[PDB]
Structure formats: C-alpha cells, structure tokens
Structure 1
Amino acid sequence: DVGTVVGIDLGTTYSCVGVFKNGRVEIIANDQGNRITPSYVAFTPEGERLIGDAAKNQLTSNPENTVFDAKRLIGRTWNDPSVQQDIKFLPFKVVEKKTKPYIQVDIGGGQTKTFAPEEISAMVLTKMKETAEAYLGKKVTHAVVTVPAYFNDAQRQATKDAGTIAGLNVMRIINEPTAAAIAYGLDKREGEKNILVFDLGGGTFDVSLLTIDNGVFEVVATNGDTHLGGEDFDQRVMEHFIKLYKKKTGKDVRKDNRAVQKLRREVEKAKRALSSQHQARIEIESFYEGEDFSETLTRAKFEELNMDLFRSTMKPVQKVLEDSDLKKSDIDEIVLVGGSTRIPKIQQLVKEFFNGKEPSRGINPDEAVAYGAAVQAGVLSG
C-alpha cells in the first residue's frame, strides 16, 4: 500500500510539495511558513545539516560549504560539456568520482565528505517528505516527482534514485510542463489543443509546446535558456545597489560576504513587492562597517535594470513555434509557470507576443507544477 502519495516539484532553485486531501489539492507550507522551499543544503561548524530556508539564509563567510543547483549536475557524467561549464560558476568543489560530478564539502570540524548529485537532491526530497509528514501527521513512503521535459534517461533515473535515498518510492516521473497543464485542468478539454508553457524559474527558463488530444499530452518541442531566472533579476539589482553604495560612500560592499547576503535577502523581498507596487524600500541596520543601508527601488528602475533579460525570453518562444510548425494564433492555451511570471513586465511581454491573448489563471505559478503532481498523487492514493 502507498498510503498518501505526495506530489513533489524538485526545482533547480526551489521545491514545492502537494497532497490530495478531502477532495482537493493542498500545497504544504514548510516549518518557516513557506509554500516553496529552497533546493539548498549547508553544514554548520558543529556539523548540523541545514536544508531549505535555513541553508539559503545561514549567514556565512564560507560559500564553498553550501550546496545548490544540484539539478544542473544530476544524471550527468563529470566530463559532460554542460557540467564542465557549470562548475566554473559554482562556489563549492566538484570532483570526478565513479564517472560522475560529485560535490565535495566540509561537513563540520574539517571532515570532508563527497556526495553524488542525487545524494544532494535526496536531502532536498527528505526535507519535502518531512514537510508533508508534519502536515499529514503520518509517514510518507510514495511520491510523484516532476522533471524538465528535456530530461534524458540518466537524468530521470538519477531523480528516481534521489527519491530512493530519501526513503521515497517515486511511482511516477512526470514532465514539469505537463504537470502545470494538468494543474490548470487542461486535460479535461475536448478536441486537439496546442499549449504553450512559459516557465521562468529561479535559475532556468523553459519553454515547452505541448499538444492535448482526447485527454493525452505530447511534448512537441522545447527551448529556453538554461541560465536565466529570477535570481538573475536579483543580481542585476544587487549590482545596482553595490555600485550606488561605492559612489555614495567609497566602500566596496563585496569585501564582506555577510553584507552581500543581507542585501541579497532584502533585494529578493523588494523584487517580489515590485510585482504589486511601484516602489520598494530596502533597509539593513549595521550593513557595512557599522553604517546602515536605506535605499528605494522603483518598478521603472527594476524594469530598466532587467529589460534585456525580460525581452530575451521571447526568442525561445519564437523558436519553439517554428520547431512545432505553428504560428502565434495556433496557441490555444498559455500556461505561466514560476514566481517570476508574476513580474508585470513579463506578463505584458508574453500577452503582447500573443496579440493580447490572456494566459490561463487561478493557480499560483510557483505551485502549478507541484499542484499537477499532487493531482496525479491523489489518483494513486485512491
């Protein structure tokens, strides 16, 4: 028996868990009150293993012992050109072991440990499993886990293996855009329809063209940008305030990594506010050399700082349309995925690209993938 099966969106930067309970999907908040959890792991000096918000928000002068972006490495060989490029931008050590890119960190007291990417993803899944168990008041043993549509055999298997390490029997591996289309109830429509899934996550941008025909989904074409996401928008704002602080004080903010991390956390909070307001306030007490930071950011400046990045999302959309032999007017449904799709300028650009066509609406875009996984989990739970 499977018990209550969970639906898990195992994302590059954030993960989300849902269940089907009392006739509906319930997205579960973690111990910090958040319905999304960072796909992050860190180790305290005492040897405590931190997962999620506590890992991402732990102030440190040692970025080399925090692990994230394991989804870029999972199911790939060490010598894969993608891996060789990615390790140049990753602050933690990556070493060749058993043909794979293993992550090497110090787990406390100088104790060096090496982890396969699926062992890191297993830690994230354990945290999602614990989040669901606290909610359900009972143990979880089975799951439906999502993956990007472009994931190959080794990547799907390594994701199932991460589940096994976490004590989860991954019953079904389903494609992220399909799970989002199911969340919007797009499988319950008559005839053949073309669905454009625009997924702008924390670190990756994925565009997928799906067809629905008599309840059956098919991934026709995929495109995007593997290194474009919500964190890039935060970084453009970080650069803006760091240069501005250098002009105003003569001080180089990046000389203190903790000051950088405090600014990063406040910038992310301000970015989210600019999706619903035209001005945000960033305040940090004893920010740098005992001096306080107090600055404002307008929606207009945020947009100006990120305009090239926002406009760059249109190119893969045009490419998928060409590769699927479709025109703009052939798109029956537009599904927005990822918290970044809440940015007004992104919503405007997509709507304008599709000649004023309104996208599907009702589900939080950061939860749509886990929501669809939970719909399937509900069927498997009986």
Structure 2
Amino acid sequence: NYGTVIGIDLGTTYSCVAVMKNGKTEILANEQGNRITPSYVAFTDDERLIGDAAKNQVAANPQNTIFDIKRLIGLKYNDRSVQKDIKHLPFNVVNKDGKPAVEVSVKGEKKVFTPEEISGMILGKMKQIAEDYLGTKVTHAVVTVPAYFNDAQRQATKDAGTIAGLNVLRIVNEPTAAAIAYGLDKSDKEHQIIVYDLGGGTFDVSLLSIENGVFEVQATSGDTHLGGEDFDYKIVRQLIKAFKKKHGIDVSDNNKALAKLKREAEKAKRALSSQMSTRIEIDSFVDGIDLSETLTRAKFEELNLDLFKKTLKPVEKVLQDSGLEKKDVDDIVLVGGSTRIPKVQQLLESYFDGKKASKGINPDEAVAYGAAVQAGVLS
C-alpha cells in the first residue's frame, strides 16, 4: 500500500510540495502560509529550524545555518565543483569518508551532518505539511531532480527521503515534471519542448522530446551559478553605494547589515515584476539612520541585462547539440521563480522570433505540480 503519494520539488533555494487528490492537484502552503519553503536548516541551542524560520535568523547564526546543500548532495569532497562551492559557503564543510558534510554546533559541541541528512530534514517538513493537508499518514513520494543529476545524486535524494520516512518511488527530472504539469505528455503528435528554468541559484535549459507518452531528455545546458540571488546582489551593491554616499557609512564588512539589504533587495525585485518602481526602506538600518531608496524597473533591468542575456547562450547550445532550429520548437515552458521578470520573458520571446512561452502555471510550483501528477498515477 502506497497510500496517498505526494510530489516534492526539492530545490536548491526553495522546496515545494503538492498532491493530487480527487481530480485536483494542489500546492500545499506551509505553517506560515507560504506555498514554497526555503531549503534552509538551522541549528540553535534550543531548536532545529527548518524553512522560513531558519532563513529568517540566518544573519544571527551564519555558522549554523545550512543552505545550498543541493550543491553538495551525492558528490565527493575532492570534486572540482565542491571545492569551488565550499569557498562561498559561510558554514564549515568537512571531508567525511571522501564526501562533503556540514559541521555545526548543536549542544555546544561539534556535530556533522551529511547532505542526505540535511535534505532529509527538508523532505520531512514537506511530508508533515502534506500529512496535515490530508489528515492522514504519508509514506511514499515522487521527488524531482535536475536532468543532469547522476545516479549517486539521485540515490542520495532517495536516501534523504528514507531518512524523512518517505519511500521515494520515482526520481523524476525537473524539466520533465514541468512538461507533465502542462499536459505535454499527452500529445497526439511528436513535439520538441524547450524548458527554460531560471530559479534562485541555478539556470537550466533542456530540450525534451515527447512521443505517445514517452519523454526523452535530448539536450541540457545552463549555468549552475546564475539565478535570482545574483539579481538581488546587484541591487545590494547599489544600496551599499547609495547609503555610503548619503551617510558616510560603508556596510561592505557588516554582515548583519548586508543580510538586511539582501532581504529588502529581493522584495524590491519581486515588486518590480508587476510595478514600474518601488521603495526600498529599512528603518534604523545602521546607527539609528534610516535607509530610504527608490528602484525603477528600468534600472533593475540595466543592472542585470548582461546576466539576463547570458541565459540565451545555453538555449542556443541546446538547439545546436540536438540539431534543431528555433521554428522546430513546439512548446516553450517557462518555469522557476525568476521567470516572472518581464525582461527575462521579453528576451526569450524575442530570441524565439515572437513565440509565446507557456507560463500559465505558477512557475514556482510547476515542477512540484508535475511531480504530484506522476505521483497520482502511483496512488
């Protein structure tokens, strides 16, 4: 007995849980009412914090707040990518039996956790959310991974499930999950699908073929270090410059101030997806002095245009590797939170000669949605 099988997008920066129950697939909000949950775990003297609460206290506890664990899962310590990644992480990463693991303080003493264990904490939260939603136990799940993940990375994700008390019945590719969400599995002919996925930390482009219900990953490309967080940082840098100009206070080496800027920068960015201008305000920012700035959409676009344009290169590469033309693409699936940015949509549409991308499904949720659809077949 599988019970009610749930779908989980275990993302680099955010996680999302969904379930198909009686003819409807829904995305399930957490206890704070958020339909997506930060992929964060924090260890304090009292509390193991998971999700929103963990991300909220990051500045107060940077050495014991874990994020970007997906960058380490299923890999070896001496991997080129791992060595590069651990330089930019504020918490301690150690070599444990040839594999990267996080080192924190739990009781006042050093404790080591595997990426499987950390991911398992996040998956456990997703499970608990689903259990309240359904009013029943949950034992089985479908969990998504990037198309380029290898067996070690897929198995580690399954193992994270096991720690969370979840039997992960299927590991499913993220772009495929998105395509399934849009019902592109049910085509009456052959189609080539481009999935453009711009998230918080990573950018992914994949070409999928679909034939009589069978998906194949034809080509993948992207940038593992290009996402929404990078767009936030450009705003952060402008705010540092502005506050220094006005008040003679440079916050470049003030981590708590920088974290406040990062939070407000992300808020401003989100606002500029639907507004032309926004107010960035922090009361009593440094030394009782208020931060009060304005950011326009035009300026945000100006600051990020080069990064936005960088996304078109992997799209070109995917078409070249598969040997297809732009006109040969039947569907463009826009997923990932950052695809809400008007300029991103504009640049992708103009690249495909005016072809409209499919964006009707909430881009934060499409992957989890598709996971839940596939899970529904197993229920």
Q: Please tell me the TM-score bracket, short chain as reference.
A: over 0.9
Aligned counterparts of 2:161 and 2:284: Cα–Cα separation in 1: 43
Distance 2:211 2:119 in 1: 34
Q: Which amino acid aligns with 1:39?
A: S
Give the stretch that moved more between structures: 287-296 or 368-377.
Answer: 287-296
CA–CA separation in structure 2 for the residues paired with 1:367 and 1:30: 14
Structure 2 partner of 1:233:
231
1:67 and 2:69 correspond: no
- Report SS of the residue matched to 2:268: helix
Cα deviations by residue, 1:10-40 (Å, 9 ceiling, x for unpaired) = 0000010000122110100001111110100
> After superposition, where does 1:128-147 map in structure 2 within 5 Å?
128-147=126-145
The equivalent residue for 2:340 is 342
Contact kept, 8 Å, 1:59 with 1:258, in 2: the verdict is: no
TM-score normalised according to structure 2 size: 0.98
Structure 1, unaligned runs of 5 or more: none
Report whether the alignment pairs 1:104 with 2:103.
yes
Shift of 1:91: 0.9
- TM-score of the aligned structures, taking structure 1 as reference length: 0.97
The equivalent residue for 2:171 is: 173
> 1:211, 1:217 within 8 Å by CA — same for their partners in 2?
yes
**Cα deviation per residue 1:168-210 (whole Å; 9 max; x = unaligned)?**
0000000000000000010111111100000001000011010
Whether contact under 8 Å (1:286, 1:293) holds in the other structure is yes
Q: CA deviation at 1:266?
A: 1.6
Alpha-carbon distance in structure 1 between the residues aligned to 2:148 and 2:59: 35
Q: Distance in 2 between matches of 1:330 and 1:183?
A: 21
Q: What is the CA RMSD across the aligned residues, in angstroms?
A: 1.0
Distance 1:61 1:139 in 2: 35
Partner of 1:55: 54
Q: Secondary structure at the match of 1:358?
A: coil
What is the Cα deviation at residue 374 of structure 1? 0.5
Q: Which amino acid aligns with 1:237?
A: I
Deviation by residue 1:326-370 (Cα, 9 ceiling, x = unmatched): 111110000011010010000000000000001113200110000
Could you tell me how far apart the structure 2 residues matched to 1:151 and 1:363 are?
25
Which sections of structure 2, spanning at least 5 residues, go unmatched?
A: none
CA positional deviation for 1:256: 3.3
Aligned-pair distance for 1:137?
1.7
Quote the offset at 1:290 in angstroms: 1.2
The answer as to whether partners of 1:38 and 1:56 remain within 8 angstroms in 2 is: yes
CA distance in 2, matches of 1:310, 1:119: 35
**Aligned counterparts of 2:58 and 2:66: Cα–Cα separation in 1:** 14
Note if contact 1:61-1:257 (Cα within 8 Å) is conserved in structure 2.
Answer: no
The CA distance in 2 between the partners of 1:224 and 1:47, in whole Å, is 40
- The answer on whether the counterparts of 1:78 and 1:101 sit within 8 Å (CA) in structure 2 is yes
Identify the residue that residue 351 of structure 1 maps to in structure 2: 349
1:8 matches 2:8: yes
**Separation in structure 2 between the aligned mates of residue 260 and residue 138 of structure 1, nearest angstrom:** 43
Q: Does the 8 Å contact 1:13/1:38 carry over to 2? A: yes
Give the structure 2 partner of residue 31 of structure 1.
Answer: 31
- For 2:209 and 2:216, the matched residues in 1 are separated by 5
Aligned length: 379
Matches within 5 A, 1:137-286: 137-286=135-284
Within 2, Cα distance between the matches of 1:70 and 1:361? 28
- How far residue 288 of structure 1 moved from its aligned partner, in angstroms, is 0.7
**Contact 2:335–2:359 (CA under 8 A) maintained in structure 1:** no
Q: How does 1:281-320 map to 2 (within 5 A)?
A: 281-320=279-318
- The reply to whether residue 372 of structure 1 matches residue 370 of structure 2 is yes
Q: 1:326 aligns with which of 320, 324, 327?
A: 324
SS in 2 for 1:146: strand
Instruction: Give 1:80's aligned residue.
Output: 79
Structure 1 position 214, deviation (Å): 1.3
